[PDB]
């Protein structure tokens, strides 16, 4: 049947263009059909982007974007496409091709994730975060790790060497404005065992080729 | 531009449960509503179009109805695989427009979150930045607020956060918030506070350091 497939660079640095293809099959791109652009940003909802039609060539646009957003279709590969310039930081998304039919768009594609930043590879820094002496009162320590300004994903974090499972929550990535992601893991413990158990993070980020650990210890007031 | 929004923000169901989600559009649309289906790294899946017409190969369970402004979405007899994403959309005019999403959980009794405060590092201190972060461990349900005050002074446009999907084994959520700083601005206040806002919270709960003091 009908199947959407994208494609298209995960990185476009700031001010290029943006430029992605949707390879269409089961149908032909000449279709009365609306082709559509639409993108999903970290945590917001979905945002119609724009469309053309296929077989009158109409191209419907967001009026903000009208300046930037070229879509177009190709019928010697049965595909169709995207070009958006002058790309900046809310640029960043998933990019889905969609085929809109009469009242719902009714085949999508999978989804491909643009990331904007002007970073190379790099490594992260880890930083401990280390339980304050006061918030070990009711007996239970949080205390984690802060692995900051790496590129691109993903880094991998576990706890003295995979020992330590229970209680951990790693946090998903966020892209920071700088273009480079961070993350935090942390882990709850009991207060006692801060003096007789060792906390270590191992952060692996391969992109890089960087092993890191990093020894977590108690603040001490006296 | 038609404004979508949608409620409750995230509801909470366990399996076999009928549950109804809310979409309200801020113009008259009649009835050009569709629902779809989102799961976790996938592409939304159609669901209901015409606010009412089931789409092929989606089950019968789910139903919608409404016209005008207010519709709704209902899912019979839930199932597993129906813990997603749902969002409404319009189609009435250009600027085609989504809502927010309404999130179905898992169902479990309220926790109100432990929370934690981290200065930064020594380490990232002689970097030259500053991250103070903020950890809201082990609640539900999902809906929390975090405010940044430094000095009693309400930070805004300087903060990120990030929380997990449901937790596998207690069906709890853990966020972090991390407030960025530059080193010469953090080394001119004292009192660093996160305020947390949550359900199970009779009223917010503070949780602050002061530099320099153990």
């Known amino acids: 049947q009908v199947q959407l497939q994208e494609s298209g660079p995960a990185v476009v640095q700031p001010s290029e263009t943006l430029s992605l293809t949707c390879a269409v099959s089961?149908?032909?791109?000449?279709?009365?059909?609306?082709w559509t652009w639409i993108r999903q940003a970290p945590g917001k909802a979905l945002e119609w982007i724009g469309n053309?039609?296929?077989?009158?060539?109409?191209?419907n646009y967001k009026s903000s974007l009208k300046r930037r957003l070229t879509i177009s279709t190709d019928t010697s590969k049965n595909q169709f496409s995207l070009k958006l310039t002058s790309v900046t930081a809310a640029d960043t998304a998933v990019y889905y091709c969609?085929?809109?039919?009469?009242?719902?768009?009714?085949?999508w594609g999978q989804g491909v994730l643009v990331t904007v930043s002007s970073a190379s590879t790099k490594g992260p820094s880890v930083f401990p975060l280390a339980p304050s002496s006061k918030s070990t009162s009711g007996g239970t320590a949080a205390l984690g790790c802060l692995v900051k300004d790496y590129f691109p994903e993903p880094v991998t974090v576990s706890w003295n060497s995979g020992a330590l499972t229970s209680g951990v929550h790693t946090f998903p990535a966020v892209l920071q404005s700088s273009g480079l992601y961070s993350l935090s893991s942390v882990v709850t413990v009991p207060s006692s065992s801060l003096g007789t158990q060792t906390y270590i993070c191992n952060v692996n980020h391969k992109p890089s080729n960087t092993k890191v650990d990093k020894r977590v210890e108690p603040k001490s007031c006296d | 531009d038609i404004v979508m929004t949608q409620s409750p923000s995230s509801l909470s169901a366990s399996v076999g449960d009928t549950v109804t989600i809310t979409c309200r559009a801020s113009?008259?649309?009649?009835?050009?509503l569709a629902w779809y289906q989102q799961k976790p790294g996938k592409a939304p899946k159609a669901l209901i179009y015409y606010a009412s017409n089931l789409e092929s190969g989606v089950p019968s369970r789910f139903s919608g109805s409404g016209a005008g402004t207010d519709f709704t979405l209902t899912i019979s007899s839930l199932q597993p695989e129906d813990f997603a994403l749902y969002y409404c959309?319009?189609?009435?005019?250009?600027?085609?427009?989504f809502g927010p999403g309404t999130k179905v959980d898992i169902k479990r009794t309220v926790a109100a979150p432990s929370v934690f405060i981290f200065p930064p590092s020594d380490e990232q201190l002689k970097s030259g930045t500053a991250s103070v972060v903020c950890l809201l461990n082990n609640f539900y349900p999902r809906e929390a607020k975090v405010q940044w005050k430094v000095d009693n002074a309400l930070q805004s446009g300087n903060s990120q956060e990030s929380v997990t999907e449901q937790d596998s084994k207690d069906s709890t959520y853990s966020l972090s918030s991390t407030l960025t700083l530059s080193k010469a601005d953090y080394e001119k206040h004292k009192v660093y506070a996160c305020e947390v806002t949550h359900q199970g919270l009779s009223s917010p709960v503070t949780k602050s350091f002061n530099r320099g003091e153990c």
């Open positions: 053309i039609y296929g077989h009158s060539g109409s191209t």
């Open positions: 969609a085929r809109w039919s009469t009242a719902d768009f009714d085949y």
């Open positions: 089961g149908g032909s791109i000449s279709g009365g059909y609306g």
């Open positions: 959309q319009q189609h009435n005019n250009y600027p085609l427009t």
């Open positions: 113009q008259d649309i009649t009835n050009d």
